[PDB]
Amino acid sequence: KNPKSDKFKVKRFHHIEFWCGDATNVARRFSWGLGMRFSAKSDLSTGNMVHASYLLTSGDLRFLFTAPYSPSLSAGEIKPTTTASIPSFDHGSCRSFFSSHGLGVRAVAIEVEDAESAFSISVANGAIPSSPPIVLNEAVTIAEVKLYGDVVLRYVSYKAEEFLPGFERVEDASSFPLDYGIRRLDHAVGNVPELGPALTYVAGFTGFHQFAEESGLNSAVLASNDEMVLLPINEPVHGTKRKSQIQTYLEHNEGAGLQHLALMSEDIFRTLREMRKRSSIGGFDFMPSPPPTYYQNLKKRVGDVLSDDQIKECEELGILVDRDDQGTLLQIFTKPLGDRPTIFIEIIQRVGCMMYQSGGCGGYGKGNFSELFKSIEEYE
Amino acid sequence: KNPKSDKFKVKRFHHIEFWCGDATNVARRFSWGLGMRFSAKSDLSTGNMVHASYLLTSGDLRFLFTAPYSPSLSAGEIKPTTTASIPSFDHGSCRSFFSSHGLGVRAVAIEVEDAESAFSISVANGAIPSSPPIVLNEAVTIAEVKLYGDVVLRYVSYKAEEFLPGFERVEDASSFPLDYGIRRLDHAVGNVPELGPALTYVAGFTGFHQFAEESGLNSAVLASNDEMVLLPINEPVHGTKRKSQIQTYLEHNEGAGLQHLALMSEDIFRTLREMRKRSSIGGFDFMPSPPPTYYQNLKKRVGDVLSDDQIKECEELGILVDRDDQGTLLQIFTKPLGDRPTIFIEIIQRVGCMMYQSGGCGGYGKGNFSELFKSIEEYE
Numbered sequence: 161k162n163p164k165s166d167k168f169k170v171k172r173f174h175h176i177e178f179w180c181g182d183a184t185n186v187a188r189r190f191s192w193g194l195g196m197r198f199s200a201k202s203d204l205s206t207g208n209m210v211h212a213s214y215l216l217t218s219g220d221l222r223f224l225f226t227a228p229y230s231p232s233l234s235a236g237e238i239k240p241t242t243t244a245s246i247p248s249f250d251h252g253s254c255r256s257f258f259s260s261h262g263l264g265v266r267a268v269a270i271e272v273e274d275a276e277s278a279f280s281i282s283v284a285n286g287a288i289p290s291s292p293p294i295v296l297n298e299a300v301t302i303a304e305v306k307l308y309g310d311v312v313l314r315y316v317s318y319k320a321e322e323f324l325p326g327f328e329r330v331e332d333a334s335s336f337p338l339d340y341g342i343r344r345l346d347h348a349v350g351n352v353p354e355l356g357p358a359l360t361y362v363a364g365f366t367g368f369h370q371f372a373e374e375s376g377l378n379s380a381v382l383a384s385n386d387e388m389v390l391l392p393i394n395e396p397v398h399g400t401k402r403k404s405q406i407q408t409y410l411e412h413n414e415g416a417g418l419q420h421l422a423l424m425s426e427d428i429f430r431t432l433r434e435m436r437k438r439s440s441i442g443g444f445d446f447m448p449s450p451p452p453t454y455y456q457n458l459k460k461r462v463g464d465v466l467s468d469d470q471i472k473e474c475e476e477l478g479i480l481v482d483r484d485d486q487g488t489l490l491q492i493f494t495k496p497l498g499d500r501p502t503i504f505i506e507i508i509q510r511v512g513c514m515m516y517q518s519g520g521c522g523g524y525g526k527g528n529f530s531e532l533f534k535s536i537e538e539y540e
Numbered sequence: 541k542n543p544k545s546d547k548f549k550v551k552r553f554h555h556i557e558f559w560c561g562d563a564t565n566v567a568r569r570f571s572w573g574l575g576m577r578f579s580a581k582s583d584l585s586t587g588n589m590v591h592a593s594y595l596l597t598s599g600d601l602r603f604l605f606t607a608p609y610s611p612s613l614s615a616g617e618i619k620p621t622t623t624a625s626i627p628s629f630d631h632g633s634c635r636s637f638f639s640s641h642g643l644g645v646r647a648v649a650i651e652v653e654d655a656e657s658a659f660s661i662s663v664a665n666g667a668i669p670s671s672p673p674i675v676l677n678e679a680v681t682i683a684e685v686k687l688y689g690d691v692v693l694r695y696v697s698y699k700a701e702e703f704l705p706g707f708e709r710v711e712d713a714s715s716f717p718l719d720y721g722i723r724r725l726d727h728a729v730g731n732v733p734e735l736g737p738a739l740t741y742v743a744g745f746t747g748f749h750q751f752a753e754e755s756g757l758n759s760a761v762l763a764s765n766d767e768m769v770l771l772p773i774n775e776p777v778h779g780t781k782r783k784s785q786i787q788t789y790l791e792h793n794e795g796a797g798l799q800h801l802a803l804m805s806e807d808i809f810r811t812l813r814e815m816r817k818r819s820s821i822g823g824f825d826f827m828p829s830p831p832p833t834y835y836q837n838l839k840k841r842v843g844d845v846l847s848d849d850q851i852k853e854c855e856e857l858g859i860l861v862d863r864d865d866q867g868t869l870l871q872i873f874t875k876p877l878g879d880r881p882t883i884f885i886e887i888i889q890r891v892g893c894m895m896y897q898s899g900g901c902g903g904y905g906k907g908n909f910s911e912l913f914k915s916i917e918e919y920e
């Protein structure tokens with residue numbers, strides 16, 4: 161059941177912004193590791209004396225990396241005269257965020273019809289304001305409300321139907337056309353100490369509905385009207401055999417924040433071949449693969465969806481498979497993206513639910529908790 | 541003339557430590573960009589609850605990348621019970637350094653016969669102490685004094701004749717044997733507001749001597765007895781046509797600090813081929829190449845050292861050539877390593893001065909200031 165109760169018109173995920181100590185090194189590492197092209201910049205070379213921001217793209221996926229310059233460079237500016245291209249940016253906020261949490265996601269940005277209306281309606285319905293609507297070059301409006309922890313939900317609306325005003329398209333020489341098949345953000349997942357209050361807050365100001373659904377967590381998924389914006393949230397379950405990875409997250413992150421980004425691939429086998437080639441030469445590492453029994457047991461579970469060759473290729477790449485009543489999910493998880501055992505990435509591809517493909521087809525892999533534990537003891 | 545006035549026995553450069561916001565992403569970027577292998581680690585997986593430190597090596601070159609964890613992880617520790625593998629590390633110091641300067645070099649480490657003696661003699665001769673000698677596992681002694689700005693000169697001495705106690709050798713699977721030919725640190729260069737006082741201070745506590753020698757700078761080089769540890773220092777020259785790059789450094793760095801690391805290659809043509817292949821896929825960019833007139837004029841200057849083919853290969857890779865009375869220098873400079881126009885890297889190879897090769901053979905490229913300006917107007 162989908163009551164379609166969005167309190168304002170939401171379109172799709174627009175971008176994810178990481179707050180960094182050095183945006184250049186994180187952006188270059190991510191570009192190589194994920195196969196994303198350098199698409200736009202806002203920095204000293206574009207007149208921005210406040211922050212360095214670099215945009216990577218792969219298909220419709222947009223990753224922004226931002227770091228502060230010395231405040232001395234902009235000490236004469238005031239907000240009316242700022243050279244920042246993202247007017248919500250604040251040196252103190254960014255340094256405090258990075259000191260507290262390490263490298264991680266500051267903003268989950270969604271495109272809406274009217275960011276000023278979305279902001280007003282959100283705050284009227286309980287959202288804690290973070291940055292009020294600001295119109296950039298009479299062309300784009302951006303506004304921010306608190307989502308959880310120090311993560312904001314950023315509203316972006318466009319008059320037209322680039323990236324942001326003040327960003328420039330990087331030079332072709334500096335823009336190598338990397339592409340490992342990643343195409344869009346499927347979902348963005350938060351970790352909180354208490355699920356109930358978090359859900360009530362976010363669903364309260366968005367009108368997002370709950371998407372139709374002992375391993376250390378309880379979870380729920382909030383979804384927009386067409387279920388294309390998907391925001392799962394996890395809480396820990398205490399007193400378990402193995403320590404909850406949600407609680408480890410909260411400890412090392414200094415509280416709530418974004419846990420993982422799930423990136424849809426048009427060909428998860430190519431994406432994983434390309435990412436695994438680069439794991440030890442600057443890219444990303446993946447979690448340890450499941451035992452071979454897990455892949456033996458895939459025949460009974462998804463033998464009607466994947467061939468034996470396609471199953472065998474899942475086995476060499478360490479890909480996980482889950483299935484609901486509507487579709488099938490291929491997924492795999494990276495090791496944490498930086499120093500702390502906090503944020504990681506999920507690569508996914510969904511099969512089924514053809515109408516375009518409806519959102520969340522195949523679920524989120526919750527069935528892989530039981531299948532992994534089963535396969536663990538089976539191969540033992 | 542070399543008075544050989546070292547006040548304690550100095551051997552060679554040992555390592556360079558970068559202070560980072562996220563050590564993982566900087567280390568992975570540098571590994572791919574420079575062709576250095578992951579060699580050792582000290583982090584949560586080795587019991588270090590204080591800092592994450594990753595060591596990259598290429599030949600004898602050692603780059604260490606360190607970032608702080610949340611202080612909450614080690615809140616119960618005191619210095620006698622610390623899990624830090626580098627006992628000089630301090631969360632506040634590291635966050636303050638990175639907030640002030642951005643990504644950059646905290647420590648220039650040299651190996652000495654006795655780090656405790658070097659520390660005592662240095663401080664007796666004017667060195668400002670930074671971290672007193674500490675013996676690690678009865679095997680290694682480390683001590684630190686201020687060099688310039690917030691950069692320290694780190695003394696390391698070994699009883700035996702790994703890396704540091706508490707570091708572990710990374711797994712083979714995570715240790716890809718990258719190698720683009722870089723073999724050791726040739727020199728490490730500081731930028732200061734006033735050269736005179738800086739030289740007097742450092743030469744005062746080390747006994748290092750001045751090495752035998754309008755473009756925006758004055759410089760001088762301090763050298764150990766065998767001239768294998770080389771520490772040039774630059775000051776700006778104000779009121780020039782083009783703004784001094786030393787003054788730009790000081791402004792964006794918030795004062796004095798390390799300007800560049802010069803890395804000796806055993807084959808600069810292979811190193812630059814490999815680095816330039818990777819510039820736009822996560823590696824390092826190089827400064828704009830000199831005009832073709834510069835390479836036309838190489839025939840008259842170094843036609844007795846480099847063939848026409850070897851000169852032509854300098855031209856395609858953008859390599860610079862200078863010559864003193866003793867040897868010839870091939871060199872090239874990267875663009876800044878991170879967000880700020882501060883630290884960069886020089887790749888060099890020296891030809892001549894065979895005895896082993898004596899230190900500083902061919903100089904530091906000061907002749908390339910005049911040759912570049914000459915070539916600029918010539919090709920105009």
Ligand SMILES: Cc1cccc(C)c1-n1c(=O)c2cc(C(=O)C3=C(O)CCCC3=O)ccc2n(C)c1=O
Pocket residue numbers: 347349379380392393394405422447493506524525526528529532
């Ligand atoms: C990757 C890893 C590292 C260390 C410990 C553990 C438990 C894991 N880990 C996961 O985090 C994980 C996450 C999801 C997942 O994506 C997800 C959602 O997107 C929203 C609903 C809740 C949920 O589970 C699915 C399966 C998972 N599995 C199977 C897994 O093992």
Ligand SMILES: Cc1cccc(C)c1-n1c(=O)c2cc(C(=O)C3=C(O)CCCC3=O)ccc2n(C)c1=O
Pocket residue numbers: 727729759760772773774785802827873886904905906908909912
């Ligand atoms: C790389 C760059 C970017 C923007 C502006 C400029 C001036 C430069 N730049 C250099 O920084 C540069 C540095 C050295 C050098 O290594 C060096 C030493 O190691 C110690 C003695 C002083 C000295 O000059 C030599 C030649 C150089 N040249 C030729 C050059 O153009």
Ligand SMILES: [Co+2]
Pocket residue numbers: 347349420422506524
């Ligand atoms: Co997921």
Ligand SMILES: [Co+2]
Pocket residue numbers: 727729800802886904
């Ligand atoms: Co140099």
